[PDB]
Amino acid sequence: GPFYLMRELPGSTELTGSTNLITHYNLEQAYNKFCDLPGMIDLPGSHDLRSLIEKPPILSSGTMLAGFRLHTGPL
Amino acid sequence: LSRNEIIQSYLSRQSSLLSSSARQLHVLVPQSPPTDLPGLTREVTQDDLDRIQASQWPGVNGCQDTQGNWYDWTQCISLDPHGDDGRLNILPYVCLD
Amino acid sequence: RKLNMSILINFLDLLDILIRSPGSIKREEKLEDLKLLFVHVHHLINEYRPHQARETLRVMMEVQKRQRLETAERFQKH
Amino acid sequence: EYIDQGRNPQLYTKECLERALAKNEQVKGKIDTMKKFKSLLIQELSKVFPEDMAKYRSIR
């Protein structure tokens, strides 16, 4: 009658990979937006070696005294 | 394991089918409540031994068939359980010598 | 026949595991479960092996007997 | 590192979103092929074994 070692299948639709995971995870509108900030920041400033050293420090990670000791002439 | 390709998958197909393989099946055999030592317990008699030697007994001395052809244990049975050209070939059960 | 059908239906239920909830505990049971079924399908047909052994002795004896009588008859005709 | 390349990091957001949808597409596709294969298998077994697949469709 019953087959040997039948058991209960899991809950009908639990969390799977067959759902739309993004729309369930409330990330839809960001994607629908998304689908340079060097240029978007050069909207503010002029343009976008030692900047390689800036990125290398990024990859690695007495103000009145300075103004007093900043003595240098004009010409 | 890592990759299966058309030719290799078809190799798997022909190898598996050559290992494995209008009805022409064996005649079905029911359950048997009379069995000789445990079930029915016949005191050793003589009709059973004469049936096992001379007559046709389809559970003991051979496998019967539709289209009528009888096959005892030392023979090989050719059948076709599918509706294809591929024929199942049951090998002999005993293989004397 | 029961164990054949149980093997196929547990394969279908393992497909239901892989469809519905792959992270379930049951698949480990399922990947054990049909293993036990496969063990029994071998363990029953190994129990045909003494019987087959005894039965080949029987048919050998019958063939033995027949061949003796055939030679007897052959020789008597000669 | 993408700032070092001088792009927007918004491109990195776009690429993370795209890889999320790529993995979700692949996984839904594998589960869909398993669905089609289960359907085909129960069709063919119902062809070859009538009574057993009848009792299976009863029990589900």
Swiss-Prot record, chain A:
Coiled coil (UniProt feature)? none
Location relative to the cell = Nucleus
Q: What does this protein do?
A: Component of the Mediator complex, a coactivator involved in the regulated transcription of nearly all RNA polymerase II-dependent genes. Mediator functions as a bridge to convey information from gene-specific regulatory proteins to the basal RNA polymerase II transcription machinery. Mediator is recruited to promoters by direct interactions with regulatory proteins and serves as a scaffold for the assembly of a functional preinitiation complex with RNA polymerase II and the general transcription factors.
**Subunit architecture:** Component of the Mediator complex, which is composed of MED1, MED4, MED6, MED7, MED8, MED9, MED10, MED11, MED12, MED13, MED13L, MED14, MED15, MED16, MED17, MED18, MED19, MED20, MED21, MED22, MED23, MED24, MED25, MED26, MED27, MED29, MED30, MED31, CCNC, CDK8 and CDC2L6/CDK11. The MED12, MED13, CCNC and CDK8 subunits form a distinct module termed the CDK8 module. Mediator containing the CDK8 module is less active than Mediator lacking this module in supporting transcriptional activation.
Q: Family membership, please give it.
A: Belongs to the Mediator complex subunit 19 family.
UniProt-recorded name of the protein = Mediator of RNA polymerase II transcription subunit 19
Species the sequence originates in? Homo sapiens (Human)
Q: Which residues of the full protein are shown?
A: 63 to 159 of 244
UniProtKB/Swiss-Prot annotation, chain B:
Where, per UniProt, does this protein localize?
A: Nucleus
- Chain positions found as Phosphoserine: S32
Give the residue spans that cross the bilayer. Answer: none
Q: Which domain of life is it from?
A: Eukaryota
Q: Which family does it belong to?
A: Belongs to the Mediator complex subunit 26 family.
> What is the stated purpose of this protein?
Component of the Mediator complex, a coactivator involved in the regulated transcription of nearly all RNA polymerase II-dependent genes. Mediator functions as a bridge to convey information from gene-specific regulatory proteins to the basal RNA polymerase II transcription machinery. Mediator is recruited to promoters by direct interactions with regulatory proteins and serves as a scaffold for the assembly of a functional pre-initiation complex with RNA polymerase II and the general transcription factors.
Binding partners and assembly = Component of the Mediator complex, which is composed of MED1, MED4, MED6, MED7, MED8, MED9, MED10, MED11, MED12, MED13, MED13L, MED14, MED15, MED16, MED17, MED18, MED19, MED20, MED21, MED22, MED23, MED24, MED25, MED26, MED27, MED29, MED30, MED31, CCNC, CDK8 and CDC2L6/CDK11. The MED12, MED13, CCNC and CDK8 subunits form a distinct module termed the CDK8 module. Mediator containing the CDK8 module is less active than Mediator lacking this module in supporting transcriptional activation.
Supply the name of the protein.
Mediator of RNA polymerase II transcription subunit 26
The record's gene field reads: MED26
Q: Which residues of the complete protein does this chain represent? A: 480 to 600 of 600
Curated annotation (Swiss-Prot), chain C:
The compartments listed are: Nucleus
Coiled coil ranges: none
Q: Where is the signal peptide?
A: none
Mind telling me how this protein is modified after translation?
Constitutively sumoylated.
Subunit-structure text: Component of the Mediator complex, which is composed of MED1, MED4, MED6, MED7, MED8, MED9, MED10, MED11, MED12, MED13, MED13L, MED14, MED15, MED16, MED17, MED18, MED19, MED20, MED21, MED22, MED23, MED24, MED25, MED26, MED27, MED29, MED30, MED31, CCNC, CDK8 and CDC2L6/CDK11. The MED12, MED13, CCNC and CDK8 subunits form a distinct module termed the CDK8 module. Mediator containing the CDK8 module is less active than Mediator lacking this module in supporting transcriptional activation.
Q: Its family? A: Belongs to the Mediator complex subunit 7 family.
Chain's role: Component of the Mediator complex, a coactivator involved in the regulated transcription of nearly all RNA polymerase II-dependent genes. Mediator functions as a bridge to convey information from gene-specific regulatory proteins to the basal RNA polymerase II transcription machinery. Mediator is recruited to promoters by direct interactions with regulatory proteins and serves as a scaffold for the assembly of a functional preinitiation complex with RNA polymerase II and the general transcription factors.
Q: What is this protein called?
A: Mediator of RNA polymerase II transcription subunit 7
Q: Which organism is it from?
A: Homo sapiens
Kindly list the organism's lineage: Eukaryota, Metazoa, Chordata, Craniata, Vertebrata
Gene that encodes the chain: MED7
Q: Which residues of the intact protein are shown?
A: 79 to 156 of 233
From Swiss-Prot, chain D:
- Can you tell which superkingdom this protein's organism belongs to? Eukaryota
- Places the protein is found: Nucleus
Outline what the protein does: Component of the Mediator complex, a coactivator involved in the regulated transcription of nearly all RNA polymerase II-dependent genes. Mediator functions as a bridge to convey information from gene-specific regulatory proteins to the basal RNA polymerase II transcription machinery. Mediator is recruited to promoters by direct interactions with regulatory proteins and serves as a scaffold for the assembly of a functional preinitiation complex with RNA polymerase II and the general transcription factors.
Protein family per UniProt: Belongs to the Mediator complex subunit 10 family.
Quaternary structure? Component of the Mediator complex, which is composed of MED1, MED4, MED6, MED7, MED8, MED9, MED10, MED11, MED12, MED13, MED13L, MED14, MED15, MED16, MED17, MED18, MED19, MED20, MED21, MED22, MED23, MED24, MED25, MED26, MED27, MED29, MED30, MED31, CCNC, CDK8 and CDC2L6/CDK11. The MED12, MED13, CCNC and CDK8 subunits form a distinct module termed the CDK8 module. Mediator containing the CDK8 module is less active than Mediator lacking this module in supporting transcriptional activation.
> Which protein are we looking at?
Mediator of RNA polymerase II transcription subunit 10
Record gene name: MED10
